[PDB]
Amino acid sequence: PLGSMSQSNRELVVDFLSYKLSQKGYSWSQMAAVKQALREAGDEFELRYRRAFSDLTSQLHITPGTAYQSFEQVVNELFRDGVNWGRIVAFFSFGGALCVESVDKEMQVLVSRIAAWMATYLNDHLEPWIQENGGWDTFVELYG
C-alpha cells in the first residue's frame, strides 16, 4: 500500500518522541498524557495492593472457551459499591494480568479477546461515570 511506510514510520517517530518527552515530565499530546498517567497508576496500584490484587486475579483464568459474561461478572464485583478512579485503575491492571497469564500459558490469541472485553465493559458500563467525573483529563490532574 502507497502510504504504508509513511504511516508506520510516523507511528514509530511519534512513539519514540512521546517516550522521550514523558521521561522528562513532558507529553506529546493530551492522549499521551492520559496513557502515561494510566501506565504509572497501574504500576502504583499493583505495588500498593499486591496481596489484595493477587486475590482478585485468582478469581478468573481465561481459556479459549471463556465467555465475556465470566469476565463481566468478576469486573462487576469490583464496582458493586460504586465507581472511583482507583477501581478503574484496578480494572485495567486486572485485564493486564489476564493478558500476561494468557501469554504465560501460550494462548496469545486471547490477548485481543481480553482487549475487546475491556473496551465492551468500558462502553456498556463506565462512560457515564467517566463523563460525570470530569473525564480522563481530571484523572490526569488527580493522579499528577
Window 71-110: contact mask with a second copy (x via CB under 8 A):
---------------------xx-xxx-xx--xx---x--
Query: What is the rounded CA–CA span in Å between residue 25 and residue 80?
Result: 36
Shortest reach from residue 138's CB to ligand QHS, in Å: 9
> Which of 32, 38, 45, 110 is the binder for ligand QHS (CB under 6 A)?
45
Whose CA is closest to 125, among 87, 89, 76?
Answer: 76
Q: Which stretch binds a second copy (CB under 8 A): 7-15, 50-58, 60-68, 77-85?
A: 7-15
Q: What is the dihedral of CA 57, 46, 126, 113, to 10 degrees?
A: -50
Query: What is the rounded CA–CA span in Å between residue 66 and residue 55?
Result: 20
Size of the site for ligand QHS (CB under 6 A): 18
Query: What is the rounded CA–CA span in Å between residue 105 and residue 59?
Result: 17
Shortest reach from residue 32's CB to ligand QHS, in Å: 18
Residues of this chain that interact with ligand QHS (CB under 6 A) are 41, 44-45, 48-49, 52-53, 56, 78, 84-87, 89-90, 139, 142-143
